[PDB]
Scaffold this motif. Structure first.
Motif, PDB file in Angstrom:
ATOM      1  N   UNK A   1       5.635  10.471   6.623  1.00 17.62           N
ATOM      2  CA  UNK A   1       4.317  11.614   5.953  1.00 17.62           C
ATOM      3  C   UNK A   1       3.127  10.806   5.736  1.00 17.62           C
ATOM      4  N   UNK A   2       3.559   9.471   4.993  1.00  9.32           N
ATOM      5  CA  UNK A   2       2.445   8.530   4.574  1.00  9.32           C
ATOM      6  C   UNK A   2       1.649   8.080   5.872  1.00  9.32           C
TER       7      UNK A   2
ATOM      8  N   UNK B   1       1.852  19.685   4.958  1.00 14.84           N
ATOM      9  CA  UNK B   1       2.376  19.461   3.172  1.00 14.84           C
ATOM     10  C   UNK B   1       1.302  18.837   2.505  1.00 14.84           C
TER      11      UNK B   1
ATOM     12  N   UNK C   1       9.616  10.935   3.741  1.00 12.23           N
ATOM     13  CA  UNK C   1       8.430  10.373   2.925  1.00 12.23           C
ATOM     14  C   UNK C   1       7.513   9.331   3.715  1.00 12.23           C
ATOM     15  N   UNK C   2       8.173   8.414   4.330  1.00 13.92           N
ATOM     16  CA  UNK C   2       7.908   7.284   5.207  1.00 13.92           C
ATOM     17  C   UNK C   2       6.738   7.807   6.175  1.00 13.92           C
TER      18      UNK C   2
ATOM     19  N   UNK D   1       1.599   9.440   8.886  1.00 15.71           N
ATOM     20  CA  UNK D   1       0.910  10.662   9.491  1.00 15.71           C
ATOM     21  C   UNK D   1      -0.302  10.832   9.052  1.00 15.71           C
ATOM     22  N   UNK D   2      -0.336  10.720   7.511  1.00 15.39           N
ATOM     23  CA  UNK D   2      -1.538  11.157   6.819  1.00 15.39           C
ATOM     24  C   UNK D   2      -2.632  10.047   6.724  1.00 15.39           C
ATOM     25  N   UNK D   3      -1.915   8.969   5.946  1.00 15.19           N
ATOM     26  CA  UNK D   3      -2.878   7.717   5.676  1.00 15.19           C
ATOM     27  C   UNK D   3      -3.168   6.873   6.831  1.00 15.19           C
TER      28      UNK D   3
ATOM     29  N   UNK E   1      -2.985  18.009  -1.157  1.00 20.55           N
ATOM     30  CA  UNK E   1      -4.491  17.305  -1.516  1.00 20.55           C
ATOM     31  C   UNK E   1      -5.335  18.671  -1.833  1.00 20.55           C
ATOM     32  N   UNK E   2      -5.289  19.538  -1.430  1.00 18.32           N
ATOM     33  CA  UNK E   2      -6.000  20.928  -1.663  1.00 18.32           C
ATOM     34  C   UNK E   2      -5.875  21.194  -3.135  1.00 18.32           C
TER      35      UNK E   2
ATOM     36  N   UNK F   1       0.844  -1.359   0.217  1.00 16.34           N
ATOM     37  CA  UNK F   1      -0.141   0.034   0.057  1.00 16.34           C
ATOM     38  C   UNK F   1       0.822   1.216   0.013  1.00 16.34           C
ATOM     39  N   UNK F   2       2.030   1.040  -0.053  1.00 18.49           N
ATOM     40  CA  UNK F   2       3.198   2.314  -0.173  1.00 18.49           C
ATOM     41  C   UNK F   2       4.360   1.516  -0.330  1.00 18.49           C
TER      42      UNK F   2
ATOM     43  N   UNK G   1      -2.968   7.989  10.386  1.00 15.91           N
ATOM     44  CA  UNK G   1      -3.094   8.712  11.560  1.00 15.91           C
ATOM     45  C   UNK G   1      -3.558   8.018  13.134  1.00 15.91           C
TER      46      UNK G   1
ATOM     47  N   UNK H   1      -1.460  17.674   3.209  1.00 16.81           N
ATOM     48  CA  UNK H   1      -2.737  18.026   3.161  1.00 16.81           C
ATOM     49  C   UNK H   1      -2.784  19.208   2.166  1.00 16.81           C
ATOM     50  N   UNK H   2      -1.867  20.210   2.110  1.00 18.78           N
ATOM     51  CA  UNK H   2      -1.963  21.075   1.137  1.00 18.78           C
ATOM     52  C   UNK H   2      -1.733  20.484  -0.163  1.00 18.78           C
TER      53      UNK H   2
END
Lengths: 313, 313, 313, 313, 313, 313
Positions: free
Chosen positions: F207-208, F306, F204-205, F210-212, F311-312, F158-159, F214, F308-309
């Protein structure tokens, strides 16, 4: 093919016996009860589901170890029970009688068929309560009247004439007590009217049986209707009918036997039937069933060729 | 029931004509082709799927607007085509002949049945290539031999005797070209050997037909086997057989007609068949089919009563 | 497409003929009855299911050996029978009339469609009993009024204009008497009002037919509506319509034939229709159907290009 | 409709580039990889499933959030990938070339159809490896040859003539990259031979299109075959074809445009196509598509009436 | 998401406009009608199924070639139409108004959800007709009241607090006009009461959104409720909300915009929303959506760690 | 999660121990055997199906009264047993060792996953027997090597990054010994290479995750890979990991514990893990899991905003 006391119990209420249907769950509790020999012939009391049938009639209900009985948990059982109750209740029954009436063994199949007739809007019994009752009382053996087309048990009509109606007995498809032998095939021919029947009409009926049912014996059980059974079965119908006449050894068993038109009935069956109606031993009667003959084989000799010829064209 | 040129095309390769099966997709392309009247009788070339049948034979293939033909997209079509090719290829065919051979109209049902026999390990044709070929050549009309049990088209055996074998033709269940009339019922009786047949064996066969098939005419189409068709059909078998004899007006159409045992064949059919074999107009022959008669109705008078009696016991 | 006497029987009760629906089981008994030639035209009495149709109308009911008739055991049969009874009963019919009225052959499909309209809450016939009756009387041939949109047999609307309504006849999906040919496709165009129709509206309708139905002939059977049949069928509509006009040889058969707008109707059909309405033999009329022509091919020459152009954008 | 580098990757082994198919699971890992902008154009290395396509081609693969791509997890993807590899591997490709070759955008549908042809035993491509390759190289844009019947992408044949073959494009049923619009209907007509075509054959083809496909524009995209698109679509085929010619602004894009028989092609399309082939702006060309005209509308004026007449009989 | 005139038509009866629902079959006839440009804005008259919507609203109904509209043949369409009629009929509407009222574009999804609430016995709207109407009038844009929990469109409750209620919008499962993108996920948070809300309750709600919905933006469309949309969507909600404010250029479009608690709403959205409410160009507003910031990121800094810690235990 | 002696038995043949798989029917007979306490630890002999596992391991096999064990009658059991045998047989095992080796408790899930990898043609293990063995020996605890991407147990990717690979453990779908809790969700991140990892890749890891992810704790069990478990579970992973370290009280249990990147691992887990690796009581370690902290919460503070941004936009 069980006793009437297998579908209901008498309740002397509001000054007369009114018969009531059993709940299948009550029957089910009965089937698990430990009963004393002294009470096997008495109505059972489950506590939860009302009165149940006499424990002696155990063999009449299919169970995990009995396929010789009926399927009392079906909807048809309730229907047939009600059908019987509706009939017996119109017969203001007296004490000394309830017992005998309920011990009357009857044909469940005959009863399931009447339920099938009365529930159908197209059938006359659906509309005439009077007709439905005459029919039921005949089937319950609580009536002098003979069964005719109008009051027939039912089935599929595969031939109808100005004088007769031939039905295919749908026993294999029954819900309550089906014939289990998939090779089973039986028909019966009822009279539309008891008045005289021309040779024209008899001839038509004899032709249809000779062409469309060549492999069937044309007999009768004494009532006023023909039974189209396959020859591989006549021998047993013989044993059966004779044993019933045999039970004549019981005053009240007034058994007028009607051996229908000798030109319609199968030759041998006419023989066997008459020897019996004369007072001979089963063996004397029986033998006539197997003794090949010749005459009375040409009542309307020629019917066969005609139908065949009509087909050719 | 189409021309042999509906399943294959000739290919003069390796110094002789070897017949090849059509691909259904090629047939499908043909069915959409715009062809000149000058080529309706020629083999078609789709480009993608090889050679296709002559556009004139369009009516022989079921389509969105034709149920009178066959189902060439089935697996059975390929099988039957191969079955034919295997047979025609063993017949080193010459130029002047290929044409006639392929225009031979044959029974597809007869062919589908042989495929059903040869694909079954239990059937003798599965093991004998020689037998399968004799059988196929008979069915393709490229053989003098008469069809017998060993080489029968097939079906369900519902009676077998030392001298005969009765088969139930399963046409309703066919994949390639099924009979569409659900009322269809036909049987055929083949000879196990061409040698003489005792009266004992004939009698047995006549008894089985009289009891188990009372509503069927016992006829024949000239070959050496009986056809058990229901009387409501004889009239058409008449038209058909006569029209075939009619085609005698074409030397080479050597038509020896074998009207089998007169004690087995249906009386009227023996009549109709003989008037024809004598040279009378259809009308003369035809009339004999409907004229009721009497004699020859008792070849073995008594068979009927016997079987019946055996059933009673 | 059977006689009205195939759905009901007259019962002169409460001082006037009231028509009653048949029970399918009664029809079924009739189908097995042996009847005298003298009574083939009389109403049959099953005993169990009431009166049945005249035995002569046997061919009108599907059976194990008839697919040319209707499916009288369906629910739709009862519905249609009732639909007819409700209509005939509003027509206080007299003795000398009952006979003729019931022998009126009508379109069962037309009747099944009206049942489909009246049972739907969205359709106007569901709410207006008066409308439903006008519609039914038109279909039963017991009315002078012409069928229009409001009283149309029904189907799927695939085009509607200020002046017309085009319906797709759903015959393949019928329950009572479906068209068996899966290649069947037919439409009809009804007038929303009988008042004058502008060239604007005619033009629109002619354009839709030219673009969306290029492979369909635009004809009419004499009533006031168009029939959109595929060209591979016109020949038969010809035979049919002519045979009906032919039956003019029977006073009372007042047959006013309305050959609708000559700009809408197919050229050849206008021809064929007029030769007939003039008194010519079928052959004279018929020939005009195949004789290619030229004029009247450009009533609104240009419609085609326009629609196409609109599509391009 | 993606780049060739979406199905395989180059592997300079055994002294030359041999192309290899992707595993879908490798593609799946790629789709989840975090990649640097610097490597979006490089082949990806999953570790478990081999090399994957360049991350920039992400949009080409359907995912939970993309239906604009292809279904790379299907069996067809592997098949098509192999089909491509088999073709590119027969083209001993050189270094400076691999890049360009793989960036060639091609029609996946065209490729899925060839797989469907080659896997079928009835189709010629099944037997000729040479034919299959010519066909594939044409579809991969790595061949000068024009596509003809023999090497057509495939589909259902709905019309075949001595000179043409019309196929129905089955795009809706595709596994890899199906057309999603259920209203989609498109056909193409290929030449069976590039030699001259008589007026007889052209006329037949023009008649079939006018009668059976009246609602379809007859155009072409420059190659040597006709495309039967519905008029509601021509406008887009216009934009498309023009944009491709527009890409002529790239030497090597030698674009010989073949505007087929002016009697077959749709009038407006001939116009639009020629203005373009002349060097006009899209707007100049485009306008000709909508400007109604008149002439060249009667190349074989009369075809329509004829077919119709043939139907009437 | 169509005009109210897509579900009903005005009928000035019994001295006032009473709105009536369309029959889908009437809509279906309309969809096939050829109408003049002059009447595209008028109510259509099918003849068979009553009045249909204005032909100009064609694009609002799904058809064989439109998936952008609604499924008017579903049961839900009738329900929603009735739901609307029941509401508009309680608003004694005047002539000059009917037009405007019906042209009001509304959310069909919002309406389908209310039908789902009112048909459920457990929901308060099932019992309070008054509540159901307030709710409907709010959704129909014919009410000043703001939507709150009690009158919410509905959905699944996935969080409820003393002050708020969070619903999961079930759009994917809708019958009338479902969201087609399977990746769709949206929630909304309604206020249980409009009275003041403690910091305690706000904090709880902000914590739930930060932990259970970390990948969702917390915005609002101006009404009094929060909308939980995923960040990959905010950009479009921006375009949308702005275009609506843009339509302020139409007196009567009194647009009070309520930008809810600045501690709850997403930082950027508060920005973008305020620039707009101030009178800036879309571009000025828009930019604030992408400009990363820092402050107001710690309204209740620490909520996250807490929930996490509670999970650990 | 049973002993290796639950899948096979040692057979000192051809001069060395070769391990053999059990037949499930043999296991089934064992499960019904009456055994002496003295033999509960010995291999069982059914007579019909070969050797069975030691009766003491009864609890390891699911039965009518045990869902805590495995499904040894599945195909997967045989596969896993073979997978183990193939590995142990490459390890020429000596007498004194067989006992210990087989008593090694291992993860059945880990083994089922490797079977899933090796049976798939796309996976590298399918092609490299050497790789499959390294992987199996690691999982069987008979290898010093650490598990990495190349030799991972498997699952869904998945990553994937230049340095890591994240897999979703498919335990719910297992055949042999599935996780029964439908709320189960776990992932693991393996290193693609053991070489140094740039801050770029770690970032990178992180970040993934923390976002996907959490709601997931980032921990490790001492081996060289991360385990993504939901916080509601860490407490138990704690008990588990500690109890394993606890078993250090058994020389040979050389337990080097690798507490991976402190910037990746969850803060508290780093704490708890280090206190343990230091020699503290469970209680001391444990407490650190619940004590809220602050620092090391911003290793790469800003990753969240980041993504999040991105995605925006």
């Amino acid at each position: 093919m069980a006793e009437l006391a297998c579908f209901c119990y008498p309740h002397l209420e509001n000054d007369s016996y009114k018969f009531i249907p059993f709940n299948n769950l009550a029957i089910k509790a009965m089937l698990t009860a430990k009963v004393d020999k002294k009470d096997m012939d008495k109505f059972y009391d489950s506590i939860i589901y009302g009165i149940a049938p006499p424990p002696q009639f155990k063999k009449r209900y299919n169970t995990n170890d009995n396929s010789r009985g009926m399927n009392f948990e079906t909807i048809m059982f309730t229907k047939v029970a009600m059908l019987i109750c509706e009939a017996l209740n119109s017969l203001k029954v007296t004490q000394a009688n309830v017992s005998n009436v309920l011990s009357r063994v009857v044909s469940i199949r005959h009863l399931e068929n009447l339920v099938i007739r009365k529930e159908n809007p197209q059938d006359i019994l659906f509309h005439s309560k009077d007709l439905l009752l005459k029919s039921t009382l005949i089937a319950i053996g609580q009536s002098k009247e003979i069964e005719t087309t109008i009051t027939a048990e039912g089935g599929e009509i595969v031939f109808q004439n100005a004088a007769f109606t031939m039905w295919k007995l749908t026993y294999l498809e029954h819900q309550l007590m089906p014939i289990l032998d998939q090779n089973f095939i039986e028909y019966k021919v009822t009279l539309n009217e008891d008045k005289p029947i021309s040779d024209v009409h008899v001839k038509e009926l004899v032709a249809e049986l000779r062409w469309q049912y060549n492999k069937f014996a044309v007999i009768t059980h004494g009532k006023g209707h023909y039974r189209i059974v396959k020859y591989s079965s006549v021998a047993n119908h013989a044993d059966r009918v004779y044993a019933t006449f045999k039970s004549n050894v019981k005053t009240g068993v007034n058994n007028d036997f009607n051996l229908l038109d000798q030109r319609i009935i199968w030759q041998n069956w006419y023989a066997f039937t008459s020897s019996m109606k004369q007072g001979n031993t089963l063996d004397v009667c029986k033998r006539l069933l197997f003794q090949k003959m010749k005459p009375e084989k040409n009542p309307f000799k020629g019917l066969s060729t005609d139908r065949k010829m009509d087909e050719v064209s």
